[PDB]
């Protein structure tokens, strides 16, 4: 690691520098490069969520962090990705839920895009639990809709980042929706 990346990581986690270091060493033993590939990263999720199709979701999470598209996530970005994938910190989290959702990366979210992640996210719910799901929103096609709803202005065209951070922050109903299993 590097001193700066050790703190950007410790001031984004309840992880100690000492821990982030032991971690690195372990990570480096599997990726001597100090960087991890989408292929590899995807496996991480297929392993710990055997009861679903994490493949899709994982790929999206991956794209959301691999900034300057090298097809690889390095330790730092990789770490903060394993985070905004579990639960907890949610603002430091929703300031990323936009990145995950603005799939094509421009600067605005579409109805398809919302539906693409809602579905990918859905494919992660063990079929078992797929049922304990509040019917109004218990299928991809639905939830996507019970979301593009709150953001009103059903443009069936666009949703800027302003309206996203506001709707998410304002009403915590969409926040619960748009986001994964915390
Ligand atoms: Ca977009």
Swiss-Prot record:
Any single GO BP term: phototransduction
Modification after translation, per record: The N-terminal glycine is linked to one of four different types of acyl groups. The most abundant is myristoleate (14:1), but 14:0, 14:2, and 12:0 acyl residues are also present. The Ca(2+) induced exposure of the myristoyl group, known as the calcium-myristoyl switch, promotes RCVRN binding to the photoreceptor cell membranes only when intracellular Ca(2+) concentration is high. Oxidation on Cys-31 occurs in response to prolonged intense illumination and results in the formation of disulfide homodimers, and to a lesser extent disulfide-linked heterodimers.
Compartments in which it is found: Photoreceptor inner segment; Cell projection, Cilium, Photoreceptor outer segment; Photoreceptor outer segment membrane; Perikaryon
Positions bearing Cysteine sulfenic acid (-SOH): 31
Membrane topology: Lipid-anchor
Record: residues binding Ca(2+) 2: 102, 104, 106, 108, 113
Result, substituting residue 31 to A: Increases calcium binding affinity at EF-hand 3 domain; induces co-operative calcium binding in non-myristoylated protein
Keywords: Calcium, Cell projection, Disulfide bond, Lipoprotein, Membrane, Metal-binding, Myristate, Oxidation, Redox-active center, Repeat, Sensory transduction, Vision
SUPFAM superfamilies given in the database record: EF-hand
GO MF terms held by the record: calcium ion binding
Pfam families: EF-hand_7, EF-hand_8
Effect of residue 77 to Q: Abolishes binding of calcium to EF-hand 2 domain. Abolishes calcium-dependent inhibition of GRK1
A GO term from the CC aspect: cytosol
Domain EF-hand: from-to ranges: 16-51, 53-88, 89-124, 139-174
Domain of life of the source: Eukaryota
Tissue distribution: Expressed in the retina (at protein level). Expressed in the pineal gland (at protein level).
Residues reported to bind Ca(2+) 1: 66, 68, 70, 72, 77
Function, as annotated: Acts as a calcium sensor and regulates phototransduction of cone and rod photoreceptor cells. Modulates light sensitivity of cone photoreceptor in dark and dim conditions. In response to high Ca(2+) levels induced by low light levels, prolongs RHO/rhodopsin activation in rod photoreceptor cells by binding to and inhibiting GRK1-mediated phosphorylation of RHO/rhodopsin. Plays a role in scotopic vision/enhances vision in dim light by enhancing signal transfer between rod photoreceptors and rod bipolar cells.
Domain notes: EF-hand 2 and EF-hand 3 domains are the low-affinity and the high-affinity calcium binding sites, respectively. EF-hand 1 and EF-hand 4 domains do not bind calcium due to substitutions that disrupt their respective Ca(2+) binding loops. The cooperative binding of calcium to the EF-hand 2 domain following EF-hand 3 domain calcium binding requires myristoylation. Calcium binding to the 2 EF-hand domains induces exposure of the myristoyl group through a protein conformation change, this process known as the calcium-myristoyl switch facilitates binding to photoreceptor cell membranes.
Membership in a protein family: Belongs to the recoverin family.
Complex and partners: Homodimer; disulfide-linked. Homodimerization is caused by prolonged intense illumination. May form a complex composed of RHO, GRK1 and RCVRN in a Ca(2+)-dependent manner; RCVRN prevents the interaction between GRK1 and RHO. Interacts (via C-terminus) with GRK1 (via N-terminus); the interaction is Ca(2+)-dependent.
Protein name per UniProt: Recoverin
Origin species: Bos taurus
């Amino acid at each position: 690691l590097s001193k700066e990346i050790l703190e950007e990581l410790q001031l984004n986690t309840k992880f100690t520098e000492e821990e982030l270091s032991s971690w690195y060493q372990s990570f480096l033993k599997e990726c001597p490069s100090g960087r991890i590939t989408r292929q590899e990263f995807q496996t991480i999720y297929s392993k710990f969520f055997p009861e679903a199709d994490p493949k899709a979701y994982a790929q999206h999470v991956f794209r959301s962090f691999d900034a300057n598209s090298d097809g690889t996530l390095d330790f730092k970005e990789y770490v903060i990705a394993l985070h905004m994938t579990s639960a907890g910190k949610t603002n430091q989290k929703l300031e990323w839920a936009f990145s995950l959702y603005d799939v094509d990366g421009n600067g605005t979210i579409s109805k398809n895009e919302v539906l693409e992640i809602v579905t990918a996210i859905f494919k992660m719910i063990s079929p078992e639990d797929t049922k304990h799901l509040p019917e109004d929103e218990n299928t991809p096609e639905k939830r996507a809709e019970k979301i593009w709803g709150f953001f009103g202005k059903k443009d069936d065209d666009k949703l800027t980042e302003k309206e996203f951070i506001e709707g998410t922050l304002a009403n915590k109903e969409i926040l619960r929706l748009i986001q994964f299993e915390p």
